[PDB]
Subunit: 156 residues, 10 copies
């Protein structure tokens, strides 16, 4: 609750171990998150080193993955966040989300200031979820919802 | 439309002039897009240099903003896309969306592969929506919907 | 209000013009902010391109600095913020504040998580001021107060 | 004391081990610093590799954390300072303090020169402390005090 | 297949081990890929950490390369793609393909927009082929076929 | 042709003017190259500042685009090549070709070494073709042919 | 004197104009500094945008260089310091001083901590002097004296 | 001595070992250099990976530091020099010497060309020396003497 | 000659003007350097902003290119050297010399220390020339001679 | 040889081991190369990771250095070339060759296009050697000969 990391490599190393154990057990993130009470994106993010799990969720997911005591502890620590290796993703799947920022980043800024005003949409007071929908033209689409609080800049 | 740009600075300089004109006329992006048949995010992105407008939309927004013939032409050209000055935004409003990537980038990758499979969520066959919703704890929230086609990696 | 910039160079150019007028008129920032009802740091930051002034304060500082209508309008527009040229300051005076980050950044993180919890000290819901005090050993000290709202990360 | 480091990884690796020990013993930084006669920010910074502890303080914190002789000696050596992994923090909590510089860096410069003159506010002859205060609109705020000697530029 | 990697080093370290075993056994990539039902470029890319192999191909190449159970599993996992160490290749053989981008990048953009329209040529719905042909002037030429689906940008 | 540039901005500025003229005349690159005897990709590259045109092709395309004498001369000068603004493209259309390198770069190296031996595929002794083909799945594909001389590394 | 710059380009552009004027009048820096009562390195640094001249010195050097009133004013303002274009000098003469840092930077740190203790040698309370002296083995040597106040790191 | 290194990490790792041993033995760099016949800055630099020690000095300091044969041999190797981790020091103590270049770099260039001519002050034919002197204002100063051979750029 | 530049853009802008004049007059660099008494590489370098010409050569090459008095003056000024735009060339022709470094840089270091000892091959006391020779296998070869003084690192 | 590497660290680690073995045996690169039939620069480059040795030469140099069978195999593999740690060398000896590129890089481009035409001097069909010669004014010089095939840019 008050313990925090200053070096992302410890939690990212743990994430690698979790993913191998996860693959050996043929688990999905959905089922690791099941029974946790937390959204699959939050639990996934914690496993990947970017969130802290409450001790209860940490023990549960720890049991599904056969994690030792130190690992379960580590998952509860407030991480040094930052999942991109070197600022810009190389992975195509992650790059596409960077690309939407290169295409729509100033549009998001302009529409945030138009609809809300001066300030930010929070990445902290924030939820995300990923939804699969059919494409009427065929195939499938991802509907990803970014739900952040508006925080105004206020003069003083 | 077969005409395209190779230097983002031309459309970005145009964007600056559009924004001054827009500020002098006290126009909103919602207003500028009304009548085009195009979503405000698409029209905004085009004004900010990140999309091409079809000829009819360009004429109509050019009328609202008092643009000359060359500016109306430039709005129709396929842009050299990339709205971030130097890869990482400095602007807090813009930066928060990059931070969502630093926190959740690997989670989005993980969940895309879990829900869809190997491949990408498209930034091209893609729709963006920004809604303002009340926050039940007070204040306002932005609900940003990313709607991208899933394209699977094809083994061959 | 609703109008925002996407290119910081416009307001930073304006800032340079403001600084020359200010020096020619022998004005202090304290003098310029007097009568705006806004703190010297906020007004200064707006002059330097990093905040928007409300219309009345914009007109008043515009009167003191002999600014034209466009400039007074630009001062009200929401900026593309980011005052550092290329990520790390070269200026010794500005660099010292980056050095405090290099020496204390992980301490600030550690102590914020210890005293507040998982989350951030906001730079948006934020006040700062700069006070000159006597040094008991001789000379003077700056006491810079950063007053930022704590925003918790909560799971979802 | 006359001994110093040239590679920050040694002290930073030590910091990682310290943080694990600290988390396993559920210690706060306040607790570790109590009895040293040193402020919590200074002691914390030392644990995190950014300050040297005096021999007595090093023994004392070394006792509280089960550190070996070599680790206690390491805490006394003058560090190679620099806590940010790669110039710009990725972690949201530390990033906000960088953002404070991106928004107010030039304002801090301007006001330091106005109030003090040509020179710097020291990061070396320097104290900081972090205060939690209640926010009258609800929630909490961090009052972070940066207290640095003013050192004027000497013409010669 | 729903298992994916978030750290390219794991698969890249495996690639190194694969290449040593491949060299000791005097195998070619064409030989490894034979019987797999998959193109040599796709199988090679998988070995080098950039594609996932289906289970039967993974087992077959694992038999040919004398890989352990864990390595054969890692070959099936969806990778964190990105084979270039630090954005720009240093290796002359790889650099030449980057140099074709530096010379023809804008030409490819221009001609894609001319022939197909606004949008992209996919790197995902994509096949590549490398053919050796005689050079009429003596020596040999590589004919590398990039076969990518066109994906239009659509207004919305 | 012995005249060469050392600063790409000159030819890239020229490219921008060409593209504007080309758009006003509603010309395709295919049409511009018709009658030069040069492949459309080579002529396009020259217009975009990455190749030199022979004098007669330069006059021909210069007539078609109504270029002045200095522009026609600049088109003949050997360029300072490099069409990417800052090493990595921001534009999605050009990015995909960089991504093919991030995915297949080491595969191309491996297969070049297997099929040809130690050395490089040339970007200089090189031809490229962009072909549109129907996709049996529906839609269209780009078949891009990179045709490069193999130059071996030889011991000395 | 309380007026300061935030954009180094104004004073650097002024420095370029000064250097051309200086070259046209065939003045040395020593001559320009003579009569100001200030050391040649200080006056020179001011002309090059890195120091503020006192009003008397400014008018004196401005008379020598035929600077206009605005330029004399600019020389008096506290600069945004930072004379290196992009962090690492490309110029051989400037680079050697950087190389001195690459070879002896950690030695300077070590010996400063040995002889003085934990702290810094100031670049602010600082004088530098360049002397020409004969090399006994023939040729000349520069004896560059860096004379910086030692400021200790203060615990608290 | 004809043996040279190509990877600075070997000698820098050795430097770290040396510094630990030196600290345990409570040795000063002055002591370690005593009796080598070499200036303390040279011996220090060699220990820190930036110079080669002659065999007699290497044996002498190796005795004082209890180094094994391989270490004593490594100290004699010509190093791959470069003591700064990533181009710009983060350490305040080392940073000040970089700041000296950011403030006076162009002044050093200017005055070298004025006093000596076109060319460089050598970092190779080069002596440095650190003296402590009393400050008349109280406290201490470092007089750091850079003594470099001038090498002219001569036309050919 | 004691006048020096601190901003390379002045001389590089001059180089661009020189090159257009040179192309218009269809001059070669051999012809321009003829009669100056200086090697073609030295005079070319000076035109391209990387060397200072002596006054007579500057007048001579200035006459050939109809340069005004200011330009002839600029050619005599000691430049701020550095011809690469951004550290790594993009142009294939220049990149090959960088690649030569990437392939042979450590070999050059190794052989310099083996043949000469600790020290450097000077880029200042240095000559280069470029010779065209026939390739007995057909075609042409460039024989580029780098001729630099060895300066040893000597202990002190 | 059809086996190739994708990760430069394998061969560079091996190069470090070779250098230690070489130093213990006090071998020069000249004697290691003796009897291979290969130039000392080529053999050295291979040992340092930048070339592949033929099987015979690998077994010979491996006998001289006591290399195991896997190391001898590795030396035969086509490397992932790139000897500079991070794009720009820090080592003064290596840096000087980069500085030659910073001073003469555009001169080399200009003279190559003048003497050969549009194209490149190859770094692949390429030889180098390093010759020691006496300086008439005392001391020694390195005469480094770069011998590369000219390859013309081919239109199509």
């Amino acid at each position: 609750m008050i313990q925090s990391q200053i070096n992302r490599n410890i939690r990212l190393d743990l994430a690698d171990a979790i993913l191998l154990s996860k693959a050996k057990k043929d688990l999905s993130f959905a089922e690791i998150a099941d029974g946790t009470g937390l959204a699959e994106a939050f639990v996934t993010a914690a496993l990947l080193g970017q969130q802290a799990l409450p001790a209860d969720a940490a023990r549960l997911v720890g049991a599904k993955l056969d994690l030792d005591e130190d690992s379960i502890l580590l998952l509860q620590m407030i991480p040094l966040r930052g999942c991109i290796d070197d600022r810009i993703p190389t992975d195509p799947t992650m790059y596409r989300f960077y690309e939407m920022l290169q295409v729509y980043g100033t549009t998001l800024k302009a529409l945030v200031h138009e609809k809300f005003g001066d300030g930010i949409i929070s990445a902290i007071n924030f939820k995300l979820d990923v939804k699969k929908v059919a494409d009427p033209e065929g195939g499938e689409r991802a509907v990803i919802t970014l739900d952040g609080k508006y925080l105004p800049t206020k003069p003083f």
